[PDB]
């Protein structure tokens, strides 16, 4: 499913992401935009052999099990395919664990390079929240 900007904002808010760990909603929407272009089915393989999954491009080396990443840690205890669902619950629950792991949102390379330090509030402009 390819979410619309405000549609995603609403879903993430509903799932408790607004200001989770001090990160406003605009940060999460900006991250999803640049990580997957709001597409829940997005996947991208990395050089180390791991793969990033879904709306928030969660990596198989640490967070989920895809059965083909030797050394995967599976910290969110879920098959990576669960992160591609049209329902973002699994992705959100796992993201909460990731952002709490010590490096905050820096865990998302696109957030660090394209969202961090920008006016993220613009990402939720005009949305009925
Ligand atoms: C969204 C996504 O999946 N992002 C991936 C990153 O999570 C990953 O970065 C590495 O993540 C691990 C797990 O959070 C980091 O290890 C943690 O480091 C912190 C502080 O340094 C420490 O407090 C934690 O104990 C430790 N976690 C454990 C359980 O070992 C690790 O530092 C990150 N590596 C780097 C280079 O930032 C990167 C890299 O694989 O991939 C993203 O896709």
From Swiss-Prot:
It is found in: Secreted. It holds the Pfam family Lys. Lysozyme C is capable of both hydrolysis and transglycosylation; it also shows a slight esterase activity. It acts rapidly on both peptide-substituted and unsubstituted peptidoglycan, and slowly on chitin oligosaccharides. It comes from Gallus gallus. This is Lysozyme C. One of its GO terms (molecular function) is identical protein binding. It is an enzyme of class 3 (hydrolase). Belongs to the glycosyl hydrolase 22 family. One of its GO terms (cellular component) is endoplasmic reticulum. Gene3D superfamilies: 1.10.530.10. In the egg white and polymorphonuclear leukocytes. Substrate binds at residue 101. Disulfide bonds join 6-127, 30-115, 64-80, 76-94. Keywords: Allergen, Antimicrobial, Bacteriolytic enzyme, Disulfide bond, Glycosidase, Hydrolase, Secreted, Signal. PROSITE patterns: GLYCOSYL_HYDROL_F22_1, GLYCOSYL_HYDROL_F22_2. Its main location: secreted. Its EC number is 3.2.1.17. CDD domains: LYZ_C. The active site is at 35, 52.
